[PDB]
Amino acid sequence: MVSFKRYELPPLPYNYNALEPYIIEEIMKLHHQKHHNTYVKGANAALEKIEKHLKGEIQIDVRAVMRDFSFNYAGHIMHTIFWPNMAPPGKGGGTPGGRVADLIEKQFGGFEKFKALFSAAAKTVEGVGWGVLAFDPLTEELRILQVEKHNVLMTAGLVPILVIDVWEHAYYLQYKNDRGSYVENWWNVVNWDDVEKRLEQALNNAKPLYLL
Amino acid sequence: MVSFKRYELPPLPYNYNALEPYIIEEIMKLHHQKHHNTYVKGANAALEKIEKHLKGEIQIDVRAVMRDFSFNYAGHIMHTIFWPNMAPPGKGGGTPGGRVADLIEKQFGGFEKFKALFSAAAKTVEGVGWGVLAFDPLTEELRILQVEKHNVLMTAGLVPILVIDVWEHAYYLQYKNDRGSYVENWWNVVNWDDVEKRLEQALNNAKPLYLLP
Amino acid sequence: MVSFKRYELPPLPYNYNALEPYIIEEIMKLHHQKHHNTYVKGANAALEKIEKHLKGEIQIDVRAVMRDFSFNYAGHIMHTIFWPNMAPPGKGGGTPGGRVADLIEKQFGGFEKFKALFSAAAKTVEGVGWGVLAFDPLTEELRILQVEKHNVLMTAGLVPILVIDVWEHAYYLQYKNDRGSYVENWWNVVNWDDVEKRLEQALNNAKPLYLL
Amino acid sequence: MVSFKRYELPPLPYNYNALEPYIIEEIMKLHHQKHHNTYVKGANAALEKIEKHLKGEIQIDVRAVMRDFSFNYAGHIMHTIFWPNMAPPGKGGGTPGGRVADLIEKQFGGFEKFKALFSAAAKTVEGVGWGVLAFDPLTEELRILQVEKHNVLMTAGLVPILVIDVWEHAYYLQYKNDRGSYVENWWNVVNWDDVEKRLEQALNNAKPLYLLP
Numbered sequence: 001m002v003s004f005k006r007y008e009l010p011p012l013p014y015n016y017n018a019l020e021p022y023i024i025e026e027i028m029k030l031h032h033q034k035h036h037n038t039y040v041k042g043a044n045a046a047l048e049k050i051e052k053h054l055k056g057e058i059q060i061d062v063r064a065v066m067r068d069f070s071f072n073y074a075g076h077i078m079h080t081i082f083w084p085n086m087a088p089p090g091k092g093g094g095t096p097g098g099r100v101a102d103l104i105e106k107q108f109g110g111f112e113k114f115k116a117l118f119s120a121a122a123k124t125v126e127g128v129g130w131g132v133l134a135f136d137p138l139t140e141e142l143r144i145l146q147v148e149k150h151n152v153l154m155t156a157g158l159v160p161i162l163v164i165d166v167w168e169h170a171y172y173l174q175y176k177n178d179r180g181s182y183v184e185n186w187w188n189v190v191n192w193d194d195v196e197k198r199l200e201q202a203l204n205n206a207k208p209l210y211l212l
Numbered sequence: 213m214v215s216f217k218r219y220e221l222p223p224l225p226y227n228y229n230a231l232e233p234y235i236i237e238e239i240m241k242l243h244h245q246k247h248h249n250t251y252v253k254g255a256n257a258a259l260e261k262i263e264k265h266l267k268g269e270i271q272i273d274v275r276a277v278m279r280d281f282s283f284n285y286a287g288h289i290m291h292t293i294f295w296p297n298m299a300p301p302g303k304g305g306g307t308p309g310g311r312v313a314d315l316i317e318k319q320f321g322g323f324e325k326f327k328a329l330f331s332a333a334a335k336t337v338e339g340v341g342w343g344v345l346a347f348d349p350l351t352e353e354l355r356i357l358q359v360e361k362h363n364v365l366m367t368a369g370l371v372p373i374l375v376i377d378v379w380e381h382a383y384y385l386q387y388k389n390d391r392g393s394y395v396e397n398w399w400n401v402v403n404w405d406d407v408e409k410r411l412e413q414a415l416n417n418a419k420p421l422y423l424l425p
Numbered sequence: 426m427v428s429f430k431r432y433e434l435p436p437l438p439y440n441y442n443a444l445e446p447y448i449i450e451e452i453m454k455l456h457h458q459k460h461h462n463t464y465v466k467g468a469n470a471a472l473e474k475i476e477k478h479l480k481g482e483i484q485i486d487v488r489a490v491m492r493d494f495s496f497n498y499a500g501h502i503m504h505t506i507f508w509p510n511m512a513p514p515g516k517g518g519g520t521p522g523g524r525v526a527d528l529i530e531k532q533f534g535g536f537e538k539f540k541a542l543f544s545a546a547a548k549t550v551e552g553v554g555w556g557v558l559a560f561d562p563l564t565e566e567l568r569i570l571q572v573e574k575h576n577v578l579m580t581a582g583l584v585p586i587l588v589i590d591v592w593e594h595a596y597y598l599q600y601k602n603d604r605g606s607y608v609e610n611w612w613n614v615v616n617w618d619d620v621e622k623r624l625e626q627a628l629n630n631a632k633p634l635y636l637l
Numbered sequence: 638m639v640s641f642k643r644y645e646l647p648p649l650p651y652n653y654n655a656l657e658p659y660i661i662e663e664i665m666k667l668h669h670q671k672h673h674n675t676y677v678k679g680a681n682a683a684l685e686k687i688e689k690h691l692k693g694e695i696q697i698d699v700r701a702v703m704r705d706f707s708f709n710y711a712g713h714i715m716h717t718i719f720w721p722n723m724a725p726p727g728k729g730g731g732t733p734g735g736r737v738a739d740l741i742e743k744q745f746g747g748f749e750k751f752k753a754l755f756s757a758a759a760k761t762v763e764g765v766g767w768g769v770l771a772f773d774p775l776t777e778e779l780r781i782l783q784v785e786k787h788n789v790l791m792t793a794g795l796v797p798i799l800v801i802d803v804w805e806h807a808y809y810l811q812y813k814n815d816r817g818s819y820v821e822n823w824w825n826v827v828n829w830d831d832v833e834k835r836l837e838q839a840l841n842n843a844k845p846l847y848l849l850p
Contacts, residue, residue, distance in 0.1 A: 001321035064489035074367035109213035139217035155286035168805035276701035380593035499792035534638035
């Protein structure tokens with residue numbers, strides 16, 4: 001038996017104030033240092049309980065510990081995508097090109113229609129959660145969905161290439177109740193270079209994971 | 213605009229009676245032709261609604277239609293893994309080798325501890341759902357978890373390589389309320405060659421999807 | 426401290442074969458003796474854990490134990506309503522009169538319209554759960570909703586007066602995947618006298634319970 | 638057929654700044670005028686959809702509209718209890734006497750142990766939701782549970798008599814990520830007279846609601 005590899009909190013690809021004016025420094029700081037950090041530690045804690053269980057050292061509720069792992073691991077991986085999905089205005093924002101633009105054109109009828117639908121999905125998440133643009137390994141096509149919490153409505157297979165966090169701690173200090181304005185503004189910091197790179201990996205790698 | 217590629221019900225990799233005595237023919241037929249088929253149709257129905265929305269032909273509740281897609285797509289992908297995860301006794305069953313056995317040693321301290329943990333996870337799914345063995349792209353290690361329905365507790369990243377369906381329609385006609393006995397018997401039809409192949413692809417393909425090279 | 430009052434499995438108001446041909450004996454047996462009994466046992470087990478913790482003997486994951494209580498308690502109370510909601514054909518079935526028929530007319534525009542709405546709610550439960558007719562203490566009106574598992578989508582306030590169990594174990598042995606036919610047949614064993622009494626109590630008790 | 642009775646936003650039983658310094662004015666204003674109002678509107682919006690469906694004017698996704706009704710009705714009712722559960726310091730805070738204190742002693746072994754269990758419940762809600770003290774009609778005893786969102790984990794029967802909102806919009810502007818300190822401070826505005834009145838109503842009404850002698 002080998003002790004599990006621990007999850008670690010990544011640094012941001014930019015400073016805490018680098019996404020101003022669209023997302024203020026205080027949100028970025030709390031969101032990274034408190035919230036994302038909590039999910040990293042929570043994922044590790046659940047794996048530690050599994051480890052101690054397997055070593056005959058403690059008793060565990062398997063369902064409970066796996067629910068804890070699920071929520072925290074999902075919080076961690078969604079955030080690991082979220083941060084580099086954004087970039088300071090200039091590098092961030094604008095209109096995508098490349099394969100992402102092509103698929104957006106073919107499936108959603110262009111960037112404006114895609115933007116409206118993605119925005120709708122993000123704005124209408126019930127409670128806290130995420131708006132998600134994903135690559136489907138079964139059809140090699142894009143799909144949009146919502147995730148509640150970090151780990152409800154998410155499915156196997158689908159590869160998130162672009163996500164927006166609509167947990168209240170992602171916008172409340174700046175936009176208060178007005179999630180809609182937050183979502184509208186977030187477009188100005190989308191790192192389309194990152195999304196394109198994610199799509200290219202998915203195009204090469206995703207289908208074979210399930211092809212078998 | 214071209215819109216969306218449709219999902220299709222795959223055939224089984226074996227005859228409906230091929231997993232007997234462990235899973236009876238009647239279950240395999242209903243499970244495939246009714247349940248799995250419904251998820252395929254449901255996934256396509258949701259995408260058709262999103263299509264009509266994008267054409268300005270209807271206004272949809274986006275949340276509602278995506279919940280429908282999420283449930284039915286998950287049902288479909290989970291079943292696409294479930295069927296080949298199994299094999300008639302002989303090719304199916306027994307103890308694994310290769311890379312899967314290696315990671316089972318490293319992560320769980322051997323097959324017997326892994327089996328006990330996977331079985332507990334499957335037996336104690338609250339309501340209907342799945343026991344899942346997955347490859348974690350972040351650490352390149354195996355993880356076990358439960359999924360409720362098809363789309364609750366599942367996370368991004370994790371790649372299922374071995375799944376057991378513990379929806380009541382997967383066992384009830386044969387094992388009745390005794391999900392425990394169903395889980396114990398299911399091990400006899402596990403296609404470890406298929407699991408090994410999935411792990412091989414995961415080891416090669418999964419990490420770069422999330423941590424960019 | 427006084428140790429919690431234990432939950433107990435009630436007997437059926439009728440023999441195991443009394444709802445035939447609409448619900449076969451093997452289902453009634455399994456459903457009552459195995460499934461309902463499990464929820465009684467689960468509810469008590471969760472409270473035993475809470476007690477050991479209150480006595481300071483063990484430390485518990487409060488979230489986990491409360492999730493266990495929620496699911497099993499809900500399973501218990503829903504079934505305590507479910508069994509007397511039904512009655513052997515003759516006592517069960519037919520068309521309601523009295524106060525139930527009256528507000529069915531007021532809220533739903535008649536029995537056939539109510540029936541179609543209730544049947545659809547029951548047939549379309551995603552996964553396992555319940556179709557529910559409830560009384561709303563805030564407006565003194567009837568509402569229909571679904572519950573998933575036993576404890577998802579249910580709300581405070583609403584008092585269930587008529588419930589149908591659409592967990593697969595409630596019908597699979599007889600109807601297989603055909604939940605639709607099960608819902609249709611179930612109408613023939615509905616104890617409208619029981620529903621009438623429940624409504625009467627709700628009319629008298631429910632509103633002066635929340636609005637103060 | 639008569640059109641449904643509409644839900645209405647009740648005003649606060651105190652000024653928006655009345656729970657200061659424990660809950661700031663801006664939070665009370667936003668929470669009531671924006672968030673609570675939204676649930677009232679959403680609950681009515683769902684009922685209007687059901688009404689048009691019953692009149693045969695539209696064919697609805699029954700599951701979707703009922704999910705909408707569930708969430709928004711729940712948000713409304715939970716808030717209708719939440720607001721009068723609190724009171725400006727003086728009337729609010731301290732420790733309860735009367736029947737609430739008696740039941741707390743018997744079920745939890747005293748206020749100290751109750752406060753510890755309820756605080757733990759509130760602080761550890763996964764995602765957004767509620768800590769709830771409820772009256773059980775089957776046993777006529779108090780029970781503590783969590784509710785996720787407004788409508789997950791809540792059961793039939795159980796009658797909420799004391800609730801704390803731990804959605805992020807209930808504390809974030811003041812306490813930021815520190816939900817723990819919010820929960821600790823919320824005890825100083827609890828309107829125990831209101832809780833007592835709720836318990837008395839439940840002792841008299843709850844059990845005879847599910848009785849059938």
